[PDB]
Amino acid sequence: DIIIATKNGKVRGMQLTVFGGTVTAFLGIPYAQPPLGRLRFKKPQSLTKWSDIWNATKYANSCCQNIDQSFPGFHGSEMWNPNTDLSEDCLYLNVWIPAPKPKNATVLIWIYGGGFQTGTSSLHVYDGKFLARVERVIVVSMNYRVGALGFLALPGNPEAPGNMGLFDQQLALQWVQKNIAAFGGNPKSVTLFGESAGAASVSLHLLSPGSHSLFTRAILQSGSFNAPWAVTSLYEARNRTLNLAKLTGCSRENETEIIKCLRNKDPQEILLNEAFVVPYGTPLSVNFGPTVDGDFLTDMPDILLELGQFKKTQILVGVNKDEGTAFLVYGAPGFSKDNNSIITRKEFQEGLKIFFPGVSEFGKESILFHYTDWVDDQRPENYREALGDVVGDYNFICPALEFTKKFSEWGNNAFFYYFEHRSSKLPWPEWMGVMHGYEIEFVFGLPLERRDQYTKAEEILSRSIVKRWANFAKYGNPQETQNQSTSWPVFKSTEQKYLTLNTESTRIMTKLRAQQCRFWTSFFPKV
Ligand SMILES: O=C(NCCc1c[nH]c2ccccc12)c1ccc(CN2CCC[C@H](C(=O)NCCCNc3c4c(nc5ccccc35)CCCC4)C2)cc1
Ligand SMILES: *[C@@H]1O[C@H](CO[C@@H]2O[C@@H](C)[C@@H](O)[C@@H](O)[C@@H]2O)[C@@H](O[C@@H]2O[C@H](CO)[C@@H](O)[C@H](O)[C@H]2NC(C)=O)[C@H](O)[C@H]1NC(C)=O
Ligand SMILES: *[C@@H]1O[C@H](CO[C@@H]2O[C@@H](C)[C@@H](O)[C@@H](O)[C@@H]2O)[C@@H](O[C@@H]2O[C@H](CO)[C@@H](O)[C@H](O)[C@H]2NC(C)=O)[C@H](O)[C@H]1NC(C)=O
Ligand SMILES: *[C@@H]1O[C@H](CO[C@@H]2O[C@@H](C)[C@@H](O)[C@@H](O)[C@@H]2O)[C@@H](O)[C@H](O)[C@H]1NC(C)=O
Ligand SMILES: CC(=O)N[C@H]1[C@H]([C@H](O)[C@H](O)CO)O[C@@](O)(C(=O)O)C[C@@H]1O
Ligand SMILES: *[C@@H]1O[C@H](CO)[C@@H](O)[C@H](O)[C@H]1NC(C)=O
Ligand SMILES: *[C@@H]1O[C@H](CO)[C@@H](O)[C@H](O)[C@H]1NC(C)=O
Numbered sequence: 093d094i095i096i097a098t099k100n101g102k103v104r105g106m107q108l109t110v111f112g113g114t115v116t117a118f119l120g121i122p123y124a125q126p127p128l129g130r131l132r133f134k135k136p137q138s139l140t141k142w143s144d145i146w147n148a149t150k151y152a153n154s155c156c157q158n159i160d161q162s163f164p165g166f167h168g169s170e171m172w173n174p175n176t177d178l179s180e181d182c183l184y185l186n187v188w189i190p191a192p193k194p195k196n197a198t199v200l201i202w203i204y205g206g207g208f209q210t211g212t213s214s215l216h217v218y219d220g221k222f223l224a225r226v227e228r229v230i231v232v233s234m235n236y237r238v239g240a241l242g243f244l245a246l247p248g249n250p251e252a253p254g255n256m257g258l259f260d261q262q263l264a265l266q267w268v269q270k271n272i273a274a275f276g277g278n279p280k281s282v283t284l285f286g287e288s289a290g291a292a293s294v295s296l297h298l299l300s301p302g303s304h305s306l307f308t309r310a311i312l313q314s315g316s317f318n319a320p321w322a323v324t325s326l327y328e329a330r331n332r333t334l335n336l337a338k339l340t341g342c343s344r345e346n347e348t349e350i351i352k353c354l355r356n357k358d359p360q361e362i363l364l365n366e367a368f369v370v371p372y373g374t375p376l377s378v379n380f381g382p383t384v385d386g387d388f389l390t391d392m393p394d395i396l397l398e399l400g401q402f403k404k405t406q407i408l409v410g411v412n413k414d415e416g417t418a419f420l421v422y423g424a425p426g427f428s429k430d431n432n433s434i435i436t437r438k439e440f441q442e443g444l445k446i447f448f449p450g451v452s453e454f455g456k457e458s459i460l461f462h463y464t465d466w467v468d469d470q471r472p473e474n475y476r477e478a479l480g481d482v483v484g485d486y487n488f489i490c491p492a493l494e495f496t497k498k499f500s501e502w503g504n505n506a507f508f509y510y511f512e513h514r515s516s517k518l519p520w521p522e523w524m525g526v527m528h529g530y531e532i533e534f535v536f537g538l539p540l541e542r543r544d545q546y547t548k549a550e551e552i553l554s555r556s557i558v559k560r561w562a563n564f565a566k567y568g569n570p571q572e573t574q575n576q577s578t579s580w581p582v583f584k585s586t587e588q589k590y591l592t593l594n595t596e597s598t599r600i601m602t603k604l605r606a607q608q609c610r611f612w613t614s615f616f617p618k619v
């Protein structure tokens with residue numbers, strides 16, 4: 093029996109067998125008052141003490157969210173859907189600790205992605221038991237509110253101030269500061285890591301003064317706040333809040349009366365209408381996302397980044413080779429996971445209208461001009477590959493590179509990776525390459541399990557990535573010092589060195605996507 097005394101009461105965990113040893117898991121510890129009734133849309137409220145033993149032996153409810161129904165029965169998409177009951181009562185977190193209990197272990201806190209509209213910490217690819225067993229770190233993950241229930245915004249109005257899901261994340265960081273020492277963790281050695289909207293979340297904790305004292309270092313996988321999908325303008329948020337009110341019959345003049353009307357709606361009615369507040373949105377529209385609320389976020393974050401207003405610490409940032417391809421089969425014409433998706437010029441132009449709905453004709457022509465200067469005008473995959481690169485460079489790679497440059501210009505060590513390994517088990521077709529989200533299982537050490545049908549080269553790759561991530565968290569330096577490994581240089585704004593991650597040979601390269609990102613970062617914001 094493993095019972096830990098936390099500040100709010102005792103929790104009981106369970107023993108897990110991992111690789112011939114033991115990991116202790118505490119799954120589903122509450123860290124806030126359930127945000128129900130009058131607490132819906134508010135900031136998370138502090139948890140009141142209990143006196144029995146809370147049984148932390150199963151993953152808790154996932155927060156309410158809409159579900160991907162595009163590929164029923166298909167593992168490639170269903171692996172991202174929630175795998176526990178949906179409930180507004182979802183503010184829980186998980187703790188994996190090594191056995192025997194560590195003395196002063198470094199702590200890794202995972203923040204999942206999902207566009208701020210979906211996600212849950214209980215997904216199989218976020219299972220922290222391998223990291224705790226192999227590297228003897230403590231792993232923490234939390235559920236935070238998503239969609240309108242997490243990010244509905246009436247700026248300055250505490251009934252729905254915005255950024256509630258980010259404050260959920262923050263209160264869980266605070267829980268770790270106050271309680272992790274009882275589990276054998278070091279609250280002075282805490283590394284946030286996350287992917288996609290989780291990585292954008294990590295980048296916003298770097299900018300939020302209220303999070304400054306709650307962590308040490310940060311890892312950003314395939315995301316950052318300056319990505320075009322990651323922050324909702326106050327103009328959009330207000331129009332989207334009022335649109336949700338109209339769709340649900342909750343339009344009033346007293347804005348507080350709107351929120352009170354929205355508080356009497358079943359979660360399902362909110363979710364169903366959430367999806368329609370943005371009329372001409374992109375696929376996978378970030379309907380309700382982070383805003384400049386004057387609380388969590390004190391100014392437009394691009395200004396904060398440019399003028400050096402962020403936590404001074406080390407960062408690890410990276411992207412995958414084919415970030416853009418997954419999104420093509422959620423709306424681009426002519427695309428399908430079940431054929432090779434050779435598209436025409438006309439289909440490409442149609443795809444740009446899908447992914448750039450608010451943009452002028454000239455802006456879309458400029459994308460076409462920069463991505464259709466072919467080396468060989470006859471390759472039939474030209475337009476298919478160009479559209480994936482357009483979407484991946486615009487939405488992920490160029491914002492990640494720009495974040496890393498601007499962050500490093502203020503003197504801190506930054507490390508950039510380019511993940512280019514395609515999982516041997518990938519259920520998606522080959523044309524989609526190295527997809528958004530498919531480095532996560534390597535970071536969490538799933539290929540270390542020899543039973544799981546990964547190759548030997550993938551076991552070794554995951555083993556090296558796990559060690560580099562653990563060494564970054566413990567020591568601020570993502571090296572693998574023992575196996576004659578390529579040394580990972582610091583990313584500087586001048587030479588812009590990065591490390592490629594693959595099964596063949598890791599290489600030091602410079603100036604990833606230099607020509608493309610000059611287009612997206614310097615020219616396209618003007619259109
Ligand atoms: O994550 C989002 N947005 C990123 C930024 C971005 C936004 N719009 C873009 C347009 C272009 C480029 C970027 C963007 C996102 C996620 C869900 C929603 C809301 N849902 C609700 C259910 C119905 C519909 C849907 O079908 N959702 C599919 C679930 C996603 N599941 C996958 C995840 C990963 N990898 C996958 C790989 C293959 C297939 C599915 C993958 C990794 C991170 C975790 C989720 C919309 C909105 C935005
Ligand atoms: C656990 O270790 C900390 C020190 O952690 C190290 O330094 C952190 C800043 C982190 O970034 C990592 O590099 C390391 O894990 C101990 O903190 C010390 O606490 C004493 C209290 O008397 C204080 O006087 C020292 O200044 C602290 N040292 C540092 C470096 O901040 C802490 O005491 C350790 N706790 C246990 C139970 O072992
Ligand atoms: C690849 O498939 C897409 C999608 O078509 C669907 O999926 C296929 C696997 C097959 O089951 C079809 O019957 C399905 O309709 C094809 O795109 C469609 O092309 C038709 C032209 O006949 C057009 O009217 C549809 O609107 C297209 N659908 C979409 C979503 O764009 C595409 O032509 C196929 N490409 C190749 C190279 O085979
Ligand atoms: C919490 O759990 C208590 C103990 O659970 C039992 O004992 C341990 C050793 C495990 O083997 C577990 O599988 C067993 O079921 C219960 O006695 C207690 O009732 C539980 N409390 C609640 C509220 O569920
Ligand atoms: C409310 C909810 O979503 N899930 C609850 C489930 C289900 O009500 C039942 O399993 C029936 O489906 O019951 C519990 O007692 C359990 O066994 O974990 C508590 C848990 O919170
Ligand atoms: C929000 O903006 C769209 C497009 O500009 C418009 O059609 C809609 O009526 C607006 N909603 C409100 C509540 O004004
Ligand atoms: C709206 O209602 C709340 C509570 O019912 C009240 O405090 C407030 O004064 C009303 N008017 C405005 C403009 O907020």
Ligand SMILES: *[C@@H]1O[C@H](CO)[C@@H](O)[C@H](O)[C@H]1NC(C)=O
Nearest residue numbers: 552555556559560572574575
């Ligand atoms: C280093 O190589 C040895 C085999 O020579 C292997 O057992 C070990 O897991 C490797 N370590 C890392 C961190 O890759």
Ligand SMILES: [Cl-]
Nearest residue numbers: 128129130131
């Ligand atoms: Cl209530």
Ligand SMILES: [Cl-]
Nearest residue numbers: 356357358359
């Ligand atoms: Cl309700």
Ligand SMILES: [Cl-]
Nearest residue numbers: 437464469474
């Ligand atoms: Cl052509």
Ligand SMILES: [Cl-]
Nearest residue numbers: 552553556594
């Ligand atoms: Cl390797």
Ligand SMILES: [Cl-]
Nearest residue numbers: 587601602603
């Ligand atoms: Cl160079």
Ligand SMILES: [Cl-]
Nearest residue numbers: 586588603606
């Ligand atoms: Cl350059």
Ligand SMILES: [Cl-]
Nearest residue numbers: 462610611615
């Ligand atoms: Cl240019």
